[PDB]
């Protein structure tokens, strides 16, 4: 296969160029709505928290995959381990509103509290990188899914449902220092 | 009389990838419209197929320069999505989060020389089983190889095949064992005419039947 | 319906389980599916 | 053999806005009849649409008086359901319990002068982006404005539009940041004839497509 | 049926879940829906 | 109102052979193809029927040698899948993991002599009830027996029947009680001609209607 | 379906309960079922 490289058009040459044969492929595991739908921990936990999907670690599966798309949209599911009652407020409620029971308040059960939250932001799609400011780095204050408050949150896990991603961005892997390739332990039967 | 049940043991605990859904608390929310929003992708491998990305040769340059020597081995890298030359590509960026792979991997070579310089290159796929990779085209010509000249069309696409015993192969070099389970690839330079400094840019992308299988996340936090 | 493996319908309605989209297109599939393939020029098989 | 179940973890706890219903204890109660009881309303926004309510200008008067000056800016207030001039209206009374809004807001100006006095007023909607709001009609005339005279029909209705980037907008000024995200509204007085003390009453109500979205309660107890 | 999101019917009958109304009209909707609109007088568009 | 249940007592605990299945955690995994893979078996008893295996006579030899004597009892072993002569066979290897059995058991006798030697053998199935097993063919000839010569076809198959009171019988000798509940089997040598050292190999396999019933595992770990 | 005694279908789909086989033969039954039987030669019953 030969082409004009500077045209930047895609070229996908297969094996049949030299006698081979392309086989069937099944790409379920690299689907967006599937690969993004699993719980990931949030390591910024406080008495009060603003659920922002950009607090996920920039190297975990869901986190680092989310940082590889410019725009995204998804409903949420949270798992909180708290002491006391858990109060939630949507995107835009004053902070004081986190202190009343009229808002969605879950009374604690023994193990933990597992809730499902809808997408409440006013923007049609959120963003992971924002070029500019919003006052008359950091994203604007309106890129979040609400806020939760309890006496003390111990663990918070988030899950993106119905994920939709737009406009991909560079995604990196761990650099190899001096080796010819990266070498690490792989699970192997004992003895 | 009421329905008797048996609360089983071992069931119910939270599995962070369970396939069931929670209980709602807040209903009747309508989203703003996003019909026909531009630039959506639904499968990572489509993005990896449509957008090639550069490799990382010595000193972190994506190009190999024509060499004046009697040794005409431009470069050599393992066929492993963890290799050192592929450490910056998007393809490896995805594959680091998956356990096994299968399929062909495309390499795109683009010449960047001036109009008054010519060259003729050759790429060969050396499968595993040889102790020392070949160092000259007369010897590596027996593998599966391809040759190309430089002219009007400046690009060339070579499909590194998937030839291995097990139908799927790992995406991480196991241990201090050497001699990668999948063979190397050697890009040679047959000859050149009046191309002293002009380069060759190399990029890599997915194939028509590439596939990643099992999701993990090995990156330490 | 990614990563959901319940045979029975959800117990709560579609209005309460999740948000509801309103109206008033997969690009990269269209891009990668129209990728040039085969050869270019002549051929002597 | 009996039906095995798996008592899940994290489910079941009381969510004060859960969509399910309790278990009864006391049955067969018949209520007294209330067919066709007068004065029922089923949506707060219908009430807000059908009944205008007054604003709160300086010193807590719902009217602006004609001024004898060379400055002809009668009043100016932010388009925000938390503004100081709207602190007493029913519309803000509802909107304080909701997170976001969208739609047009109607203003009703009613003249209360004697038959022997005339005036000609103008209202303009200054969108955000200007540092200092205009102080004269020659300058504010470039916005979206409306002018009206005084005669037999003494009322005038102006529909403050919803023009903003995000499809929904907050109902609370965020922080000590100034220059409200939605623009101001300026009610000017072009000229007047023999109306020294006679007033103009201003009221505000909902529009044909106003909508409040997310319920909260921020009032401290 | 405001704020109820169960697909299945209630397990208890309509007589025990709540009280039962007897017999022998939404006003403000009728008021706000008959609101005058448009313009008044002449028009020079 | 919600479905009332009654969490029963005594139900739910894990029974290591319960017939119900767990909850998944990891979905959408496709296996590599193994259509028409060679050498599959689906029932242990088919394997035991199609492949005879040798017994273990004195000193651990699978053959009995022709003896020069006036006593012509070559061998004698109990019909019990725990017997000493059957300790190495595949059939007993299966039957040690089962509680009861029923059906016929086949014995295959193969002659291994030179062309210039002849012999004539007899096998008889002595049922239980006799105090001392017979020691001569004139006496054991009254049981169910079979005789065979040596010629072109060198094999002979004898089907030890299942004749017992209870429809099923144990596969383990109970206690220090002797005189096995199922009778013995005696392989005699009627006469021989010029076969001084030549042997007879004996093997055993399952029958057309053999059946094992209840799974256990008595092997101590 | 060895050692499964539930009458109702599984609650989770066939894709999540177990792996799914792909394609592109019981030998020992064929061997043991074609075993020679009866007698050989002549017979005087």
XYZ file of N, CA and C in Angstrom, chain D residues 101 114 125:
9
model
N -33.417 27.781 36.619
C -34.612 28.282 35.956
C -34.308 28.494 34.480
N -52.695 61.537 37.265
C -53.940 62.231 36.995
C -54.106 62.453 35.496
N -33.217 46.012 28.061
C -32.604 44.839 28.674
C -31.135 44.797 28.278
